[PDB]
């Protein structure tokens, strides 16, 4: 197996010089060996990507997925760790930067079908990784406007050159 | 267990390469690198330029005030006496100032004899562009002046690089002849202007105003902007050609996306034609008089 | 198909294996402090005068019979024991321990401080940056009392010496992200503590190790935290009604 | 005086910043205050805050983002309190939203904020060669359909009245101001510095004098968002973006023996309490009428 | 029918990352004005409903303890009172349940 | 700004809903009655 | 493969050869061994030809390092700051001399595909073609179906 | 094609649906408030409304008596139905039951659940969704509109 998301939270940064901007706090957390399915957990992880912690918790509260409760517990534990261990005030000033789901060690069993035939059934386990960054959530990216499209098209036309000319 | 050492050593080399890619180390000094010999480097730098410098002058020019201050701080921190030799390093401030002055004067004279029609502001802008931080630092880095410059902060900021380069220039002026120094300046700074445009380094604001002032100086009444050719007016990308007529005589023409841009380009073309800095001008003469 | 998971981490301790240990656990120091010295509340005002503090500190060390008998027992157990030469050694040990904690030199910190002192000074600080310095000493450290505990079951005598220390220290504790957390590095704030050192007399080596750090109950409160702290209330079950205390 | 409007704005902002710096330097250290939460949701909550630095907005952030999104006003143990005004001593805080049982204080705060925003739009939507002087914000009750602001215009501007196009331009300017989030800051100053802060509007000087007369300590409450500074009673909303619907209903020229004043009446609804299109049209039609309530 | 060729990862992603299969964000989430917990606008509050359910379960447990049989149901109205309360004139003549707990704030006398 | 969905009945009070219904009904009745004579306008 | 590898245009460092030619090879460091049989060619080259090459080209700093190594190597560092490392493992003296001459003649630039075999600055002498450079102008500049 | 259909399919058929509705109605009568699936509660609302109307017809009505005998499986509830619910529902015309959707069940099925309650029961009031007070901004503006309308007449 591999365990690096847990150790990523043990890194120590050098003291900031007087005048440098305050570096936002980053907290890494992970839940290992969850009975939930990898893709089903990935759907929930993608649901709360880039959102605020409170809004993610609110969505997970009313989400009917089984892993919604697990992710809510993970977020609560991560917030508690950020408040207690790390020097992070304003516990509601955290946003989910990354939220990923991977697979783990599966279990192999026999699933009978009939006529003496059987298949391999995989009891699946998933790992959930979450990263919380202190600060307001980043704004969503708006679709490219017509003026920006025109600027890009004009730039592409102007960047042309006579190929195979000299 | 595969019995072998070549594969293990090759994989260790691969791991070192991967580590280097993952975390790039900070740049280190060429002198601090193992293969280094300062006297041999100085001699090679002198010989590679087809020049005859003085070793003492080069050593004087290649030291810096920041380096001297760092050495003095180390001396004070260590508690050893270095006032006998460290204080006699003979900082290159005088050499750098002499190099700056001589280079500016020589470039001004070169541009005046090459383009008599260039105004004082134009020639000053050209000299400042040639002596600017970017060009001088690029030349010094390509000539490995940065590696031979004794200074802390191995990045060697642009002011330090320019100071070292002009100190080397002043040392060359003191060692060899002024004509040889002028030839070196021509070969290593004017060549950076090859293929460049006058306005790219002049950065004027009112081409039309400058053109009308130049025409007034040259005893020309006024330029008239007339639309010569165009391609599309209601299209998303119109193209216009504006020409300048003095006494109903076309002096220059310029294309543009809009009429104002075309007129500005025509004024720029007329100004370049009047000053002689044209794409069809005489190439710079690189010979031995 | 018949495969199961393994490696279930559990911590279950039983009295039988603890009592069936072939070798007893070797302890270099005691658990805590047996006799805690209670300082008078007027020490803060007494410290304003030099002789009015020094004479009292000298008189109290001599008038106590327990301290004198403890010093006599220490001297008879180990020769070349001088009370007058002790405060300088204690001050140097404290300064070097603070420097080692600043430098994260755990080996030297273990050599200096004892096993009852190391965790209390390493636990909450192992993941933070410390910038501590020594600038001045307003009052020289003063030996207040000396205590000794003798356990006859193993024939072990542990001697602890209490020294009042009034120091001028500058402390700056940073965060793991590099931001300042506790205090500034240029303020020479004054502190007054009581360091209790422990030394095993039976041991032939017997290094002096700092054991306890006593603060007076009337000591001024510590400097405020730079951040803001929210204290949650009691979590209430749906069937439980809240009670507001008055 | 030969002063450009931008120069006046710069001078007012600089003086306000100097007063704020003096207020901040008044406290040399960071004192810890224990603030209780007396709200119905989470009783017994304790906040360890910095004196004259922490804010009820920071307390709401400590609680949860829902409090920041919903709660507009703070009741510090005896009185309303805006979110961006630093706390002074240990106390208890209760948060107040739009949909509370007795939201009247929040309604007054929103009314005053809308009046101040309309005055800010009016003062800068007029030509530089003309003179525009804001008088005050008459506190009319929530029963009245529009918030009113008093403006004295140039003498040659007393003939014409703004048309539908002008009202729509004012509404567009107000919406543009809303689009950019400008927090409301409350600063406790004295009449001695308020006089030099304003120094140009005689009506504003008279308002400052009459507001300082009733205060024995000569304390004047100033509010500033962006580059606009005005004096008003009570706290204000923390954020401008709370105002979602905003319209400049009409103007009514009231003529007195000394001068004639344009009373601009406008209508606004917050994001939490936005209404339907027909309801908004009916409310605007009601607000078109004259509102007269000064004492 | 059997598949003809293995579906590539790009096709799989384009199939199972479409917004139709993605979980939509619900904008009806609100906080309960009473207890401050989360609830939907068209659904009752879970916390308050749990409190009411607990109280009702206790009341029904006591009223079933009062009736020793399964088919012994009251033929008249029933009234529940808490400690420190007495039946009024309009509450008299009905079956009476008495609780040791005090009257909750949400529960009105009426 | 994660604004929630709002309908016309969410923010109204008990006494106001009948008032709104009446203010819509009579307005619609007046609008319909106004156009009842198109040939004379 | 052009699509697989990188590419660059035909360029010269610091416009070399315009005013004067500068040898782009700055330093040349040989690392060899005295007892390894593979270092025979490097040892013989150091014995014979390194002094003549140094005399012919004084602008390059030549370093020689015998060390307990198995792979004899040559590191050339150019004025561009580029470092090119080659192996002289089991090569004859003629091959070593040819490699050294090739390194000296190289400009130190990246050995990748050159898009064009030519590089001319401002090739628009006497003008550059535009769709209006061959179309005669009508009287008054009128459009084909525009009436004045 | 399910056009013009008012009865939804439940259980193992029509008789199974009738029996399930009868059991739910018996439980509702016995406990004065029950919780079940949202569809089941919605279906049972009509039968609960009809049962009160049948009980209001009188104790001596043989049709109502046999209807109660069929529906109320527990015969101890029939006297309760005819002597408690019917007497207390006299002036009320159709406001006999209240139905509210509760959050989904904590079981893995996550079914949509509702709760039905007979009005005037001896149970703690449910957290009914209360309208905003008239002191709100929009409510006060509507009050001003109402006052203006009243003054105009
Ligand atoms: Mg079988
Ligand atoms: Mg398979
Ligand atoms: Mg499979
Ligand atoms: Zn609730």
How does the major sheet of chain C shape up?
Answer: 4 strands, antiparallel
How much helix is in the residues of chain C? 25-40%
Q: List the helices and strands of chain F in order.
A: H
* Cross-sheet strand order for the largest sheet of chain C: 1-2-3-4
What binds here, in terms of ligands, is: magnesium ion, zinc ion
Helix-strand sequence of chain C: HHHHHHHEEEEE
Rg from Cα of chain F: 17 Å
The largest sheet of chain F is: none
Helix content of chain F: 40-55%
Binding site for Zn(2+) (chain E): 32, 35, 45, 48
Subcellular location (chain E): Mitochondrion
Protein name (chain E): Large ribosomal subunit protein bL32m
GO molecular function (chain E): structural constituent of ribosome
Detail the topology: elements first, then pairings:
The structure is cut from a larger assembly and holds eight protein chains of eight kinds.
Chain A: E1 26-34, H1 38-47, H2 53-62, H3 66-84, E2 94-103, E3 107-114, E4 117-123, E5 126-134, H4 146-158
Antiparallel strand pairs in A: 1-5, 2-5, 3-4
Chain C: H1 15-19, H2 43-46, H3 51-63, H4 65-77, H5 86-103, H6 106-112, H7 118-122, E1 129-151, E2 156-174, E3 189-200, E4 209-214, E5 229-231
Antiparallel strand pairs in C: 1-2, 2-3, 3-4
Helix pairs in contact in C: 5-6
Chain E: H1 9-16, E1 29-31, E2 38-40, H2 46-66, E3 78-82, E4 95-99
Parallel strand pairs in E: 3-4
Antiparallel strand pairs in E: 1-2
The structure holds magnesium ion (3 copies) and zinc ion.
Question: How would you summarize what this structure contains?
Answer:
This is part of a larger assembly, with eight protein chains of eight kinds. Chain F is an all-alpha fold and about 40 residues long. Chain F has one helix and no strands.
What does this structure look like?
Chain F: Belongs to the universal ribosomal protein uL3 family. Chain F: It comes from Sus scrofa. Chain F: It is found in: Mitochondrion. Chain F: This is Large ribosomal subunit protein uL3m. This is part of a larger assembly, with eight protein chains of eight kinds. Chain A has 166 residues and is an alpha+beta fold. Chain A has a single domain, classed as Ribosomal Protein L22, Chain A. Chain A is built from four helices and five strands. In chain A, the strands form two sheets. In chain A, strands 1-5-2 form a three-stranded antiparallel β-sheet. Chain A has a two-stranded antiparallel sheet with strand order 3-4. The N and C termini of chain A lie far apart (59 Å). In chain D, the strands form three sheets. Chain D has a five-stranded mixed β-sheet with strand order 2-1-5-3-4. In chain D, strands 6-7-12-11 form a four-stranded antiparallel β-sheet, sandwiched between helices. A three-stranded antiparallel β-sheet of chain D has the order 8-9-10. In chain D, α4 packs across α5 and α6 runs antiparallel to α7. The longest helix of chain D has 22 residues. Chain D starts with a helix and ends in an 8-residue tail after the last helix. Chain H has a single domain, classed as Ribosomal protein L17 (50s Ribosomal Protein L17, Chain: A, Alpha-Beta Complex). Helices cover 48% and strands 11% of the residues of chain H. Chains D and E meet through loops of D and loops of E. β5 of chain C pairs antiparallel with β2 of chain D. Bound molecules: magnesium ion (3 copies) and zinc ion. Zinc ion binds next to α2 of chain E.
